[PDB]
């Protein structure tokens, strides 16, 4: 079970542009990833859900696959 | 789920160059994207469907992948392709006219009211529309009315126990032929074809074709009925090419 900040316990479809930016910042610290630029995912949650794993990898060569799977686990819960 | 403007509910292949520009403007707001230049995709829908995901990324480094996937989702959860079918069968009119009966109609066979005379008359709708159209609508407002009617026909079919199990078994092309009839004579009218609807469900194409051709509907509008029947019989667009 993965426990994220309170403001993000909302379904990813309702996440604002700023929410995904906070998610990125949280994931970076929680998972000891390489620094993620704040402008890597300039989009809201609805747009975040449209993206394939390949898109995550392209936007984040170091952590994309991890980020995508993290999202699938959040959706799964 | 994605809820796009009514006129863009038509399959992308019908999209004009202005349509893709409008899709872009909508997508930018719906998905909180970085501003999208209006000149990013200077082309119509047919051309947009030829581009690769790499092309989208190249043209929109910030949103290209999102736009491409958006497009894939729009294509995935079409929609029988019935726009040109009904364009041919009903016609496209931008200004109020009278049908074969005498009732005021506009767009693609959209009934406004059964009220007569020329004393305004109707004047609505005119929102629906609208806005004060004063009798004249755009291509897009005609597409809006058309999609609202298709949705009314589909929900009419899905709320009918004689039509729903038939529509469910039918393939994408034949579904359009069923909606075509519902568009022309209404839910209750098509539901009256009890025996013929049972034939289509059991895939008896030739038998259903012969049975439908003996109808009052066929006698009243032979040319159109023939085309709809041919669609039911072959499962192609041979009659509309
Ligand atoms: Mn008509
Ligand atoms: Mn249009």
């Amino acid at each position: 079970s993965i426990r994220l900040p309170a403001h993000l316990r909302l379904q990813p479809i309702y996440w604002s542009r700023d929410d995904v930016a906070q998610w990125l910042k949280w994931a970076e610290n929680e998972f000891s990833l390489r620094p993620i630029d704040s402008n890597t995912f300039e989009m809201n949650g609805k747009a975040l859900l449209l993206l394939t794993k390949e898109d995550f990898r392209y936007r984040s060569p170091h952590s994309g696959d991890e980020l995508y799977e993290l999202l699938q686990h959040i959706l799964k819960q | 789920s994605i809820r796009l403007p009514a006129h863009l509910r038509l399959q992308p292949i019908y999209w004009s160059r202005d349509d893709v520009a409008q899709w872009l403007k909508w997508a930018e707001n719906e998905f909180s994207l970085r501003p999208i230049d209006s000149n990013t995709f200077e082309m119509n829908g047919k051309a947009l469907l030829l581009l690769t995901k790499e092309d989208f990324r190249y043209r929109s480094p910030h949103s290209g992948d999102v736009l491409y996937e958006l497009l894939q989702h729009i294509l995935k959860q079409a929609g029988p392709n019935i726009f040109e079918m009904l364009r041919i069968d009903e016609g496209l009119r931008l200004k109020i006219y009278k049908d074969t009966e005498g009732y005021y109609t506009i767009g693609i066979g959209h009934l406004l009211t059964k009220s007569p005379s020329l004393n305004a008359a109707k004047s609505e709708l005119d929102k629906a529309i609208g806005r004060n159209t004063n009798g004249v609508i755009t291509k897009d407002e005609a597409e809006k009315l058309f999609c609202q009617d298709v949705d009314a026909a589909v929900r009419g079919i899905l709320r009918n126990a004689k039509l729903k199990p038939v529509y469910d078994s039918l393939d994408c092309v034949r579904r359009a032929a069923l909606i075509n009839m519902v568009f022309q004579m209404g839910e209750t009218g098509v539901a009256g074809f009890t025996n013929s609807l049972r034939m289509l469900q059991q895939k008896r194409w030739d038998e259903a074709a012969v049975n439908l051709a003996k109808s009052r509907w066929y006698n009243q509008t032979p040319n159109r009925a023939k085309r709809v029947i041919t669609t039911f019989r072959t499962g192609t667009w041979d009659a509309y090419k």
Side-chain angles (χ1 to χ4, degrees), chain B residues 7 16 19 140 143:
Chain B
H7 83 93
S16 66
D19 286 324
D140 281 0
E143 292 165 348

Side-chain angles (χ1 to χ4, degrees), chain B residues 143-155:
Chain B
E143 292 165 348
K144 175 179 170 61
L145 288 160
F146 174 76
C147 286
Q148 286 175 170
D149 288 342
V150 169
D151 283 350
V154 169
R155 274 182 276 99

Side-chain angles (χ1 to χ4, degrees), chain B residues 139-193:
Chain B
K139 193 177 185 297
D140 281 0
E141 285 164 344
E143 292 165 348
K144 175 179 170 61
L145 288 160
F146 174 76
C147 286
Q148 286 175 170
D149 288 342
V150 169
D151 283 350
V154 169
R155 274 182 276 99
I157 294 166
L158 296 177
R159 281 185 282 97
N160 193 288
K162 192 83 93 345
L163 293 171
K164 186 180 183 291
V166 177
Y167 183 88
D168 283 349
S169 62
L170 290 180
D171 52 290
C172 200
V173 170
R174 287 183 176 88
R175 286 184 184 185
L178 187 59
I179 303 165
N180 191 318
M181 295 176 67
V182 181
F183 197 98
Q184 182 179 352
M185 71 206 79
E187 173 191 329
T188 308
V190 184
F193 295 84

Side-chain angles (χ1 to χ4, degrees), chain B residues 112-117 119-121 124-126:
Chain B
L112 292 167
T113 182
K114 294 190 178 105
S115 182
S117 190
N119 290 228
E124 285 79 17
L125 323 160
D126 198 0

Side-chain angles (χ1 to χ4, degrees), chain A residues 14-48:
Chain A
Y14 307 118
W15 293 351
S16 65
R17 159 97 78 101
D18 303 56
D19 285 332
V20 334
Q22 259 56 58
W23 173 68
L24 262 28
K25 194 178 180 178
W26 171 82
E28 180 181 323
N29 188 54
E30 182 68 25
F31 300 107
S32 301
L33 308 167
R34 291 289 306 175
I36 315 291
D37 181 56
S38 304
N39 301 5
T40 310
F41 294 84
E42 293 157 306
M43 65 189 70
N44 66 21
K46 283 182 286 182
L48 207 255

Side-chain angles (χ1 to χ4, degrees), chain B residues 55-108:
Chain B
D55 295 333
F56 273 71
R57 295 196 213 264
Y58 188 95
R59 293 181 168 254
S60 174
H62 302 128
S63 303
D65 51 1
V66 175
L67 279 340
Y68 182 82
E69 292 307 320
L70 207 199
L71 186 67
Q72 304 314 122
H73 280 242
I74 287 171
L75 294 170
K76 227 303 168 187
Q77 48 92 129
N81 175 24
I82 202 183
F83 175 77
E84 197 184 332
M85 189 187 191
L86 284 172
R87 196 334 198 157
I88 295 160
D89 290 338
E90 301 278 351
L92 202 174
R93 287 272 202 159
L94 293 303
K95 156 73 93 71
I96 271 84
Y97 71 100
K98 303 176 184 180
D99 61 349
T100 59
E101 304 274 23
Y103 313 127
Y104 289 107
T105 303
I106 199 169
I108 299 177

